[PDB]
């Protein structure tokens, strides 16, 4: 038998010996083994927490904010345009294990409408977004000799 974590472990070895604990206990602790299914990726491990604890850790499992990942999705995190702008070449080279997993970017729009009172801050944004821009706008070339 293989079990959950340290605390889980301790407890068992502990009670196992407090003589006054139903012969059923030893049994259960005993023969009860983990669950290891290679294919699929299933792992049902025997555990022990507490009502309020299971409560926690549980939801942490049922909310593993981790979606899959196909060459296709990578391709897609890309503006509908550009791909349709011949001037630019696209291609794949690395493969993708059915192990792939990413974290949603969460891009819900404005949510907060500051663009209608918080001038002070917009100015600071614009400024920012602006410098940002200059950093990108490619430099020019082949000009006409100043002189």
């Amino acid at each position: 038998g293989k079990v959950v974590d340290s605390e889980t472990a301790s407890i068992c070895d502990a009670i196992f010996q407090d003589e006054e604990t139903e012969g059923a206990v030893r049994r259960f602790i005993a023969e009860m083994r983990q669950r290891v299914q290679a294919d699929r990726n299933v792992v049902n491990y025997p555990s022990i927490l507490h009502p309020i604890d299971y409560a926690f850790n549980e939801y942490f499992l049922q909310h593993q904010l981790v979606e899959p990942l196909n060459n296709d999705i990578i391709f897609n995190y890309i503006p509908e345009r550009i791909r349709n702008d011949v001037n630019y070449i696209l291609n794949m080279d690395r493969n993708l294990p059915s192990t792939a997993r990413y974290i949603r970017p969460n891009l819900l729009q404005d949510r907060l409408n500051l663009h209608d009172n918080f001038e002070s801050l917009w100015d600071t944004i614009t400024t920012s977004n602006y410098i940002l821009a200059r950093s990108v706008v490619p430099d020019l070339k082949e000009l006409v000799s100043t002189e």
């Binding site: 059923a24 049994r27 259960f28 023969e31 009860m32 083994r33 669950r35 299914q37 049902n44 025997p46």
Partner: protein, 397 residues
């Protein structure tokens, strides 16, 4: 075959011993056995039907094992299991039924269906277990050249036969002497009549006899024997032996005299009872012989004397009779009886699916016809077919 059996006690001792609650180790020795099965299966494909109105269903396997854990079985454990059993249930049904129809002459005792012919395969034997179901217990012992039968009831050994034999008759049928009877199931009623009331008979006694030959030996039979044949104690108008006319029977009943019942085996008397009415034991026999007499009453009150004149017309017909019923018995061959549903199950499945008459069984699995000509082939097929019906009834009734 034996394979088949397990598949069930597996499920019963399953759909029964597995319920929201029970502690862990009450199913350890069980769970195991179960899984073992699943494995052997998954991968192998099956087919049933293709005969009469029998749905040709296709079956596949690919089911997970278990979460051989949790102490006091949590509800969630059950449901994820029942859903996997209900495929085996609805399966086996379609399996039994498929091999519960095919008949084979030469060697009919063996498996027939494309479903079962694959089960007797070797890679499957990894399953057999708990053969305490009376029928399998007996199937095995039979493949081992050995003796042992089944416990029956108000058994069905006598093919229906209702007739008479006139030992003395004449065209007018006004002074007959003979016997009439009804042999059916586990019962025999026979009456001996003498219109003349033995007026000219030696010692004023007319002897009667009724012999019934069983198609199979019955052992350890508990039998009720009673004087009188109520069935032949009332006025009747009967067809003549040649069917050309009808005669009148107007019985008056007297006690059967010198009653002797013999239960014989191969011509030898095994049990004999002289005038013993009530419960008697016949331990091993293939023939029953009932002998009884009508003795003209030596002393008669006027009312009685008036019924029996010295000369014709004979208007009151002296009759003596016996009734014999086999309450229970053991037979080395399968038979229909008053309690088991085997015959009815086999007959019912065949009727429901419009199964065509085959080369072995009489049309409609007719019992009288079957027992009348109970050939080795019919018996081997009947046993195979009865054993399957019993396997099916463990899950589907």
């Amino acid at each position: 075959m034996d394979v088949l059996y397990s598949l069930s006690k597996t499920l019963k001792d399953a759909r029964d011993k597995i319920v929201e609650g029970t502690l862990y180790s009450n199913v350890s020795d069980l769970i195991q056995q179960f899984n073992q099965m699943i494995i052997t299966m998954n991968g192998n494909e099956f087919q049933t039907g293709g005969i009469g109105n029998l749905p040709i269903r296709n079956w596949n396997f690919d089911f997970g094992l278990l979460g051989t854990t949790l102490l006091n079985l949590d509800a969630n454990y059950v449901e994820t299991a029942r859903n996997t059993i209900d495929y085996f249930v609805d399966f086996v049904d379609n399996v039994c039924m498929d091999e519960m129809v095919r008949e084979s002459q030469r060697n009919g005792i063996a498996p027939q269906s494309d479903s079962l012919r694959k089960l007797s395969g070797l890679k499957f034997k990894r399953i057999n277990f708990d053969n305490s179901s009376e029928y399998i217990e007996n199937w095995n012992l039979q493949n081992r050249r050995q003796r042992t039968g089944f416990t029956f009831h108000k058994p069905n050994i006598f093919p229906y036969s209702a007739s008479f034999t006139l030992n003395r008759s004449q065209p007018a049928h006004d002074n007959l002497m003979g016997t009439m009877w009804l042999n059916a199931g586990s019962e025999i009623q026979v009456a001996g009549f003498d219109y003349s009331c033995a007026i000219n008979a030696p010692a004023n006694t007319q002897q009667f006899e009724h012999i019934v030959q069983l198609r199979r030996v019955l052992t350890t039979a508990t039998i009720t024997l009673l004087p009188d044949a109520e069935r032949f104690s009332f006025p009747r108008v009967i067809n003549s032996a040649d069917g050309a006319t009808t005669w009148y029977f107007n019985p008056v009943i007297l006690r059967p005299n010198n009653v002797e019942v013999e239960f014989l085996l191969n011509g030898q008397i095994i049990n004999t009872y002289q005038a013993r009415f009530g419960t008697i034991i016949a331990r091993n026999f293939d023939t029953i012989r009932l002998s009884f007499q009508l003795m003209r009453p030596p002393n008669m009150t006027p009312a009685v004397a008036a019924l029996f004149p010295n000369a014709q017309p004979f208007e009151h017909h002296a009759t003596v009779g016996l009734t014999l019923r086999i309450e229970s018995a053991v037979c080395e061959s399968v038979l229909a009886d008053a309690s088991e549903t085997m015959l009815a199950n086999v007959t019912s499945v065949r009727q429901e699916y419009a199964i065509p008459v085959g080369p072995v069984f009489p049309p409609g699995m007719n019992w009288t016809d079957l027992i009348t000509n109970y050939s080795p082939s019919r018996e081997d097929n009947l046993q195979r077919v009865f054993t399957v019906a019993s396997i099916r009834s463990m899950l589907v009734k």
